[PDB]
DCLRE1A (Homo sapiens), 341 residues
Amino acid sequence: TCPFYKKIPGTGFTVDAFQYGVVEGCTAYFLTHFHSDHYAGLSKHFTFPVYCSEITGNLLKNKLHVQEQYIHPLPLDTECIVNGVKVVLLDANHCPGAVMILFYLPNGTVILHTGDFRADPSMERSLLADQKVHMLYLDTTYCSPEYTFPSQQEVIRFAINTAFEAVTLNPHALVVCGTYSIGKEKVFLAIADVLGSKVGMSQEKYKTLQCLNIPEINSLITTDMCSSLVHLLPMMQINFKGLQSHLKKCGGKYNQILAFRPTGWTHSNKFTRIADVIPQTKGNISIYGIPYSEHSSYLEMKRFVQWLKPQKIIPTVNVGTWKSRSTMEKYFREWKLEAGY
Ligand code: NI
C-alpha cells in the first residue's frame, strides 16, 4: 500500500507514488524527477494530474507517452497554487529536472520534501531562507559518516586530465562512458569537449538527452558512432567482455579503450584520495570507477539540516530495516543537540 512517507498531511497530495494504483484520496500526484524507482507506474494510460518540472514533463511526454492534458509543469522558484495549496519547486542539484517541493499548508505548517538531492550551501540563499520549515522529508541515501566523496568539480578535473593524456599519447584510443538513467551528463560531456569530439550514442539515449534543455546540445551529441571518439553504452556493458566486444564492432579504427564507470560510493573512498585512483586493466582495456555522486555526502546533509533546523525529520531512503531507521534517528538527535534547536 502507499507508505506514509509519500503522503503530505493536510493535503490531497502524494510524492513519487505511482506504483500503488489509485491512492485513495489523492487529488494531485507530484513527481520530483525522472528516475525509475520514482516514476514506476506512469504510462500513457495514467489519467490523474501530475505536477513536475518542465524537463520532467518533456520526459513524461516523449519517453513514457503520458498524455499532455495530464502533465502540469511548473516553473522553478515561483509561488504556484495547486488545488488551493501554495507550492514552490526548487532546484535539487540531483539529475536534470530534479526538484525539491515546499508546501505551505492552510493551517500554517510549512513542509519541504527534498526528493533526491545533493545538498549545497547555495540552497541556503534560495526561497528556503525566507521562512521556517516545520517538517523535512529527507533524502537519506548516504546518512552515515563513512560516506565521504569529493566535489563534482574535482572528479570532472580528474576525468578530463586522464582522458586527454591517454588520447594524446595514443590517438587510436577510444573513450567509453557508462550510463543507465539521466544524470551525470557532465562526465561524458566534459571529456568530449576536451577531446574536440561529440559524444556518440544509441537513438534511445539521444532522444532522452534531447528532452533536457541543455544549451548547445546539438553541438555535443550525435547518433553517428563513426565520427565520435567518446561512446556512451549501458552501464551493464562496462566490463572486459562487453568492451572487447564493442572494440571488435569499431572495425580497427581503435586499438585501446579507456572506460569510465561513474559509481555513487565505493569503499575505496574511506582510504583513497581522487589523486590516487587507479584503473582495472586487462590487455588494452582499462576501467576507472570514479565517485561522481548526485546525492548528499554525510557532511553536506548534516550541514543543510543544521542550517534548516526542522522540527521533525521523516526519512525517505533506507527506511526498510529497523537497524537503519534506528541509526538515522541517532544521527538526527546528535545534530540537533550539537546545534541547539
Ligand atoms: Ni534519483
The pocket of nickel (II) ion is lined by residues 33, 35, 94, 116 (CB under 6 Å). The longest helix spans residues 152-169.
